[PDB]
Design a protein around this ligand. Structure first.
Ligand SMILES: [Cl-]
Ligand SMILES: [Cl-]
Ligand code: NA
Lengths: 10, 99, 99
């Protein structure tokens, strides 16, 4: 329940 | 405000008249919210992160309040594990990282 | 420094004697780096992200330098699409979000 949100548009 | 990072930087947002919790995410290019109804037409987008990619619905020029600050911009809707406020809206509310 | 969010907030880090580029990520609980060797013991871990879960190796008490600033903490190594500095080390360099 480590959550890690890098996010980019594919 | 000045927000330290000992806990997740969770804030209240207001979108479509309702209050939700979301995470301020300097590692997110975009803003992504859990399934909800939004007005108007949408366009397709794919977004990637740890884990892989997901399909989302892109809605433009959506009125959204973030911790009390007004923004109007693009909101992605889909099966994200968490509501995330990304740099497109963090820049609208004048947020910076400081150390 | 004060870092704006018009572009991804990337910095140079030194870890395991190597220089790398990493994303300062307030929406990450943990620090996650692409495959590399680190000294000492490790244990397996599953972490989530947009996308789902990935399996990583967890190394504790790893010294890192982030944009000039020394810290120590846990580092996760595995198939992340981006090196990220998460909150466990952002706190140690005194990073805050401000708006
Ligand atoms: Cl936008
Ligand atoms: Cl502090
Ligand atoms: Na160790």
């Amino acid at each position: 329940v480590s959550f890690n949100x890098p996010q980019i548009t594919a | 405000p000045q927000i330290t990072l000992w806990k997740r930087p969770l804030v209240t947002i207001k979108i479509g008249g309702q209050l939700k919790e979301a995470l301020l995410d300097t590692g997110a290019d975009d803003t992504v919210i859990e399934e909800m109804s939004l007005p108007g037409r949408w366009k397709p987008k794919m977004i990637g992160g740890i884990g892989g990619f997901i399909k989302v619905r892109q809605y433009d020029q959506i009125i959204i309040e973030i911790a009390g600050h007004k923004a109007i911009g693009t909101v992605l809707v889909g099966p994200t594990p968490a509501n995330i406020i990304g740099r497109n809206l963090l820049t609208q509310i004048g947020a910076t990282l400081n150390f």
